[PDB]
């Protein structure tokens, strides 16, 4: 299998990397592991203007006031258990958001702050019949209401919730109150069931408290039951949020209709659906095991056909110290990170099931040393029924001596591993910034990108509407609209000239500059920077972009095209020559 | 004779060089390993970095000063300080064209430690360092002509007081040293190997303006200068007046809208790339004393070569073996040529100085050979940074990566060996040998980077190395804590809604690589605390109720559980 991509050759896979606490999404070529693009999401990007432009701030909403995010879990939308290449979704643990990225333009196009929760961590997508819901865990228990009356996590109204977002509308669909908390989550291959690990069944705030119980659990959600209660109006609402809220807590040992709690040791972490749809596999973390939940036994479990929730466990292989996450080659093998032993362990799932029945059989096939302390791992197409068994990325948290020293802060080590054969082969050490936690690969032919914008693209349609109100045809017009102390500049751009090369305003005016790149050649992006005003943005071919700033300094102020004589001048008349307020 | 260096750095092997890439319009500096071309680290400078909290923390905002209000930068030209014409590994400097700044990066901690807004100018673009006897000055071009004063009375760019200026910054103090008014616009700049001369390409035939830095220093020492506005910076007038020269400058006619301005590693030439002219112009540095002394009949007499090379020459670099390498933007090539043969051709000899043209993909701007800015230029690696990558990488939407192409120059024939895609047009880069960079493994508790925070802690009676304390001061709350995986030293505290909370964390772990983080959920608060570092961040607790904070940097098996609670009592 070819590991090295030479000049003129192209990568075989796209890789979509979480940006970690840096807040972006990164597009890599696989197997070269080179970074092809950065997609700003929760970060403010000087280069494109994301977080500065009106289009981007409109998408972020009120959360545009935050300059940070913390992402972990990128996932690609699916149709019938296969990637359809439409959307990528990712979490923000820092400011409790989910974002949607459109894979045709490689931009974030939608963002939501999840109501009545703190810290969106675990995230994964419904697989079947398609990605109708984005499933997202809120990790931290909080009071409801959280108004400063009650701080006690043991209060009956202190809890966290499982969250379902409508993937197409990026509005909330429902939330389910759970016992304990929520770590990671995955969905089955039918649409009925989703599942999440919990590490804080104790509802504690201290370290020893969260570690007390020998078993926490994975909570299983009957999504069909949830939907039926919503359609029946059997729900409540919290605060000013209209989101339907269902109670999936146990009441005095009696289960709700919406959830079952399968005891799993111990502070379990990863929650991974095998690519054949047979299992939710929970990684034991503090227990040296994974627990294999038989999805085929879940209907009987919710129908009371089983005596003990543990009856849905059909395997619990002992694997090594600190199992965190599991992935799949599509050949029947699972691959699990061992954080403490610092390895990836390859094991056969059907043999583990047989060992759980007492059959003496060695289900462990290989242990590969990684460098060092691996967290997530990802095999190519592992989240689909097309899991191809070719590439594996293990994302390790301490790179130590594997790269040149660069000061007290080290890179992460994302190691590419060839799993096409019976023996795992470490082929490449990939240093990355700010701790990507996890990544997702797609075949080259699963992603179809636009090379030039459509003039009706929803990304800037609000700006087109604003322009229409000013009587502006954006494809042609080079005009300065004045409106009190507001100035709206509209111009076309075509290399190497701005359509408006100078304009004059009064000191203190609020200036909006809207630029429509009317070029039609690929790769010829333009930029716009106003010197010493903190203004910067990208305008690609046929895109309209706009940015608003206060002309707070009198005098002449240059603007220039960043993304390459293509310059202009803003002239600001001093306040003392104009009416005084 | 052959170019046959190994390019593969396999698992467990280390790169041979550091590469320092400009972050382009994204505003950071990036550390790469060469020849693997992998990005080892991002150093935030003019960008706001969610990961480390640069732009959010009190330490970073103190370094940025008032310019902390800007969330953008536009970087181009990274350079490493020198002693006796060789890299000394102390500092890296870089420009900000967008908000007119220069930043200094300390190469032992790989952080920006100083930043200056250059007064009375717009857009710092070209930038290079004094070489000899060391980098006493950072030389920086302000690109755009503006009125002086720029107070809104005069907008006329032809006015006698409309001009731009060449800027000298004291590398060690990061304060302005002096500014020189010039005729025309400044493009790129470089310095000689004595400390006496610097040069910059100019567009108003245009010119290369040469600065006699010794003459400038003498005028400053004598008090023969003016100041502009409210800046104390000495300002000298390097313009021609009624055709008569300043003592500070000479204008050497050079075709045509010349762009790159590069000092050859043997110290013989300032080489200006011709752009609109399919040539480079070679200025003999050893004729400059005669030029300034009035012993030459014509400023053109310092030109000793003008080789014809191809369409669109933009920048030049050196292998230390006598060859120059120049980017041809239109022809989309690197052309390797012999400088002494070009000089003889200029005198009329029949000699072909062109050695090879290598196709690059596509439209190269800057290029950089390893150690090319030093008298130790080693002729091993070349990076050409091309603007239009077209079909050289997988498609990724309407925006495309820059193509930074690694070229083996160790032998007679240039060999293209790697295409490296990069984000936001890095534009230019610089390389250093592995052994020229020495980095700290853990922070020093006396480090100036957070010394102002240590001072604040001292005013509160706090021993940062041990204390876990909450200081109440009106509506201000100052939390001080130690951190040691997997526990914050203060795991809960209570404030009043509206309070201004400062959280100062000292990571007292001693193990390399065990960094800690701090994030306050739904408050826009995030920062890094590496081993032995103190970091602080200020935010207002504007929301009543229980608000979680957690460690963002995976540091331990129990990392998910390294958390705390801020309790905010309602108004
Ligand atoms: Cu957020 S956790 Cu194992 Cu996913 Cu990294
Ligand atoms: Cu300390 Cu994560
Ligand atoms: Ca527990
Ligand atoms: Cl998981
Ligand atoms: Cl140059
Ligand atoms: Cl040679
Ligand atoms: K790390
Ligand atoms: Na929204
Ligand atoms: Na400063
Ligand atoms: Zn440049
Ligand atoms: Zn250039």
3-state secondary structure A31-71: CCCEEEEEECCCCCCCCCCCCCCHHHHHHHHHHHHCCCCCC
Closest CA to B427 of B260, B185, B184, B198: B260
Q: Distance, CA B470 to ligand 4 centroid (Å)? A: 37
Q: Are B238 and B166 in contact (CB under 8 A)?
A: yes
Decide: helix, strand or coil at residue B486.
Answer: coil
Q: List residues near ligand 1 (CB under 6 A).
A: A 72-73, 121, 269, 324-325, 375-376, 437-438
Task: Provide the number of CB pairs (under 8 Å) joining chain A to chain B.
Answer: 375
With respect to residue A580, please indicate whether it lies within any of the assigned structural domains.
Answer: no
Angle CA B214–B77–B377, to nearest 5: 75
Q: Are residues A445 and A465 in the same domain?
A: no
Measured in Å, residue A531 CA sits from the centre of ligand 10 at 17
Strand order across the A391-396 sheet:
A374-379, A391-396, A412-418, A425-432
Structure tokens at A306: 């089983």
Method underlying the structure? X-ray
Instruction: Report the candidate in A165, A143, A140, A168 with the shortest Cα–Cα distance to residue A156.
Output: A143
DSSP B196: S
- What is the best residue among A20, A184, A267 to mutate for testing ligand 1's pocket, by most ligand atoms within 8 Å of CB? A184
Q: Which atom of ligand 2 is nearest to the CA of B486?
A: 1
**Using CA atoms in the order B249, B250, B255, B259, what is the torsion angle rounded to 10 degrees?**
-20
Query: In angstroms, rounded to a whole number, what is the distance separating the alpha carbons of residues B280 and B262?
Result: 10
8 A C-beta contact, residue A7 and residue B405:
yes
Chain breaks in chain A (C to N over 2.5 A) after: 564
In angstroms, the CA A350 to CA A332 distance is 7
Nearest to A267 by CA among B556, B23, B537, B307: B556
Out of B422, B450, B478, pick the residue that ends a domain: B450
Q: Which of residues B450, B472, B488 is at a domain's end? A: B450
Q: Measure A530 CA to ligand 8 centroid, in angstroms.
A: 29
Q: Does A37 reside within a domain?
A: yes
Give the whole-angstrom CA distance, residue B364 versus residue A279: 53
**Of A509, A507, A511, the residue nearest A530 (C-alpha):** A511
Q: Is B14 on the interface with A (CB under 8 A)?
A: yes
Count CA atoms within 13 Å of residue A347 on its CB side: 31
Mutate to test the pocket of ligand 1, among A92, A435, A438 (most ligand atoms within 8 A of CB): A438
- Does a structural domain hold residue A68? yes
Owner of token pair 């819901």 = A133
The length of chain B, given as a count of residues? 571
B248 with B397, same domain?
A: yes
Is there a contact between A148 and B568 if contact means CB atoms under 8 Å apart? Answer: yes
The 10 Å CB-count burial string (b at 16+, else e) for A386-408 is ebbbbbbbbbbbbbeebbbbbbb
CB A121 within 8 A of CB A91: yes
What's phi and psi for B452, nearest 5 deg?
-60, -30
Phi and psi angles of residue B285, each rounded to the nearest 5 degrees, phi first = -60, -35
On whether both B438 and B455 belong to a single domain, the answer is: no
Q: Whose CA is nearest to atom 5 of ligand 1?
A: A437
Give the alpha-carbon dihedral of A60, A65, A71, A77, to 10 degrees: 0
- Which A residues, 215 through 254, put their C-beta within 8 Å of a C-beta on chain B? none
What is the A335 CA–ligand 5 centroid distance (Å)?
Answer: 51
**Interatomic CA distance for residues A556 and A571, integer angstroms:** 4
In Å, what is the CA distance from A539 to each residue of A39, A453, A494, A496, B54?
15, 10, 11, 14, 27
Cα(B85)–Cα(A80) distance, integer angstroms: 64
* Pairwise CA distance, residues B314 & A255, whole Å: 73
Give the integer Cα–Cα distance in Å for A42 and A74.
13
Q: Which ligand has the nearest atom to the CA of B170?
A: 9
- Asked if A362 and A473 sit in the same domain, the reply is no
Of B452, B455, B485, B567, which is closest to residue B520 (Cα–Cα)? B567
Question: What CA–CA distances, in Å, run from B535 to A147, A402, B529?
Answer: 30, 27, 6
3-state SS, residue B130: coil
Q: Is B11 within 8 Å of A402 when comparing Cβ atoms?
A: yes
Q: For chain B, how big is the Rg over CA atoms in Å?
A: 26
Beta carbons of A47 and B69 less than 8 Å apart: no
B365 and B471 belong to one structural domain: no
CB contact under 8 A, B401 and A534: no
d(C-alpha B311, C-alpha B83), whole Å: 36
Mention every residue, 6+ apart, whose C-beta is less than 8 A from residue A121. A72, A73, A91, A93, A137, A138, A139, A182, A183, A184
**Nearest atom in ligand 2 to B485's CA:** 1
| Cα dihedral B219, B223, B226, B227 in deg (nearest 10) | 110
In chain A, residues 364-393 whose CB comes closer than 8 Å to chain B = 371, 373, 375
Ligand minimally distant from the alpha carbon of residue B64: 9
Q: Select from A535, A545, A485, A539 the least CA-distant residue to A514.
A: A545
CA gap A400, A193 in Å, rounded: 41
Per-residue exposure over A530-546, b if at least 16 CB sit within 10 Å of its own CB, e if not: bbbbbbbbbbbbbbbbb
Pocket (CB within 6 angstroms of ligand 2) = B 485-486, 516, 551, 553-555, 559, 562
Identify which of A550, A565, A556, A576 has the alpha carbon closest to the alpha carbon of residue B148.
A556
Dist CA A38 CA B401 (whole Å):
9
Query: Which residue, of B450, B472, B490, is where some domain finishes?
Result: B450
- Tell me how far apart the alpha carbons of residues A10 and B419 are, in angstroms, rounded to a whole number: 11
**Distance between CA atoms of B62 and A372, rounded to whole angstroms?**
35
Ligand that comes closest to the CA of residue A91:
1
Cβ separation B51–A399 shorter than 8 A:
no
**Which of 505-524 (B) contact A at CB < 8 A?**
512-513, 515, 517, 519, 521-524
Query: Which ligand number lies closest to the CA of residue B336?
Result: 6
Co-location of A452 and A491 in the same domain:
no
Exposed e or buried b for every residue in A55-68, given b needs 16+ CB within 10 A?
A: bbbebbeebbebbb
Kindly state the tokens that stand for B372. Answer: 């090319």
On whether both A202 and A270 belong to a single domain, the answer is yes
Q: Are residues B480 and B413 in the same domain?
A: no
Distance separating the N- and C-terminal Cα atoms of chain B: 79
CA angle B398, A491, A577 (to 5 degrees): 135
Q: Which domain holds residue A497?
A: 461-574
- Tell whether A581 is covered by a domain: no
Other residues' Cβ atoms within 10 Å of the Cβ of residue B493: 18
Number of domains in chain B: 2
A180 and A320 co-located in one domain: yes
Contacts of B545 in chain A (CB under 8 A): 142-143, 145-148, 151
A343 and A297 inside one domain:
yes
Please name which of B390, B475, B376, B387 lies closest in space to residue B432, comparing C-alpha atoms.
B376
**Residue A277 near residue A385 (C-beta atoms within 8 A):** yes
Query: Is the domain of A428 the same as that of A465?
Result: no
The CA angle B506-B509-B511, to the nearest 5 degrees, is: 140
Identify the CA nearest to A476 among candidates A495, A500, A456, A453. Answer: A500
- Distance from the Cα of residue B133 to its chain's centroid: 21
H/E run at residue B20: strand B17-22
Q: Within this chain, do residues A495 and A449 fall inside the same structural domain, yes or no?
A: no
The CA–CA distances, whole Å, from B491 to A140, A155, A523, B479 equal: 15, 20, 51, 11
Pairing of strands B176-182, B235-237: parallel
* 3-state SS, residue B258: coil
């Amino acid at each position: 299998q070819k590991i090295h991509v030479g000049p003129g050759e192209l990568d075989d896979y796209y890789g979509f990397w979480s940006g970690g606490h840096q807040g972006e999404v990164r597009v890599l070529g696989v197997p070269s592991m080179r970074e092809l693009m950065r997609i700003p999401v929760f970060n403010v990007d000087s280069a494109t203007g994301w977080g500065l432009t009106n289009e981007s701030r409109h998408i972020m909403g009120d959360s545009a006031k935050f300059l940070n995010g913390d992402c972990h879990h990128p996932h690609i939308s699916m149709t019938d258990g296969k990637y359809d290449g439409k959307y990528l979704f990712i979490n923000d643990k820092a400011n409790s958001r989910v974002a949607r990225i459109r894979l045709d333009i490689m931009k974030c196009d939608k963002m939501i702050t999840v109501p009545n929760v703190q810290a969106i961590h675990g995230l994964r997508l419904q697989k079947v019949p398609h990605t109708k819901y984005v499933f997202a865990n809120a990790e931290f228990i909080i009071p409801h209401p959280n108004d400063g009356k009650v701080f006690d996590l043991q209060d009956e109204n202190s809890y966290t919730m499982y969250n379902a977002i409508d993937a197409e509308t990026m509005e909330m669909a429902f939330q389910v109150i759970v016992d304990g908390n929520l770590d990671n989550t995955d969905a089955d291959y039918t649409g009925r069931f989703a599942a999440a690990t919990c590490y804080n069944s104790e509802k504690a705030f201290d370290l020893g408290g969260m570690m007390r119980n020998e078993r926490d659990w994975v909570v299983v959600f009957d999504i069909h039951a949830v939907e039926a209660a919503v359609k029946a109006g059997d729900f409540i609402t919290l605060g000013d949020s209209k989101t339907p809220v269902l109670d999936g807590r146990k009441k005095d040992g009696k289960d709700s209709k919406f959830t079952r709690y399968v005891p799993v040791p111990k502070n379990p972490h990863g929650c991974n659906t095998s690519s054949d749809g047979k299992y939710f596999i929970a990684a034991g973390k503090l227990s040296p095991t994974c627990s294999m939940i038989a999805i085929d036994k879940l209907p009987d479990l919710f129908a009371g056909k089983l005596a003990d929730p543990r009856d849905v466990i059909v395997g619990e292989p002992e694997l090594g110290l600190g199992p965190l996450h599991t992935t799949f080659d599509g050949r029947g093998n699972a691959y699990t990170t061992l954080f403490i032993d610092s390895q990836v362990v390859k094991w056969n799932m059907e043999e583990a099931v047989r060992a759980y029945k007492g059959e003496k059989v060695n289900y462990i096939k290989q242990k590969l040393d990684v460098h060092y302390q691996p967290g997530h791992l990802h095999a190519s197409l592992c989240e689909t029924n097309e899991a191809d068994g070719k590439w594996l990325v293990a994302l390790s948290k301490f790179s130590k001596d594997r790269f040149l020293p660069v000061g007290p802060l080290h890179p992460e080590n994302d190691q590419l591993i060839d799993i096409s054969g019976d023996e795992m082969k470490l082929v490449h050490d990939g240093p990355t910034f700010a701790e990507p936690h996890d990544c997702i690969m797609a075949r080259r032919d699963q992603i179809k990108t636009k090379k030039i914008w459509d003039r009706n693209d929803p990304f800037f349609a609000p700006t087109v509407e604003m322009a229409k109100k000013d009587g502006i045809n954006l494809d042609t017009d080079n005009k300065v609209i004045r409106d009190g102390n507001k100035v709206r500049v509209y111009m076309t751009s075509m290399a190497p000239a701005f359509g408006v090369q100078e304009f004059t305003v009064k000191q203190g005016d609020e200036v909006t500059v809207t630029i429509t790149n009317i070029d039609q050649i690929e790769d010829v992006s333009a930029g716009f920077v106003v010197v010493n005003h903190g203004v910067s943005m990208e305008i690609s071919p046929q895109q309209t972009s706009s940015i608003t700033f206060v002309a707070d300094k009198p005098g002449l102020h240059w603007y220039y095209c960043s993304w390459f004589e293509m310059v202009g001048r803003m002239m600001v008349e001093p306040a003392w020559s104009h009416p005084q307020f």
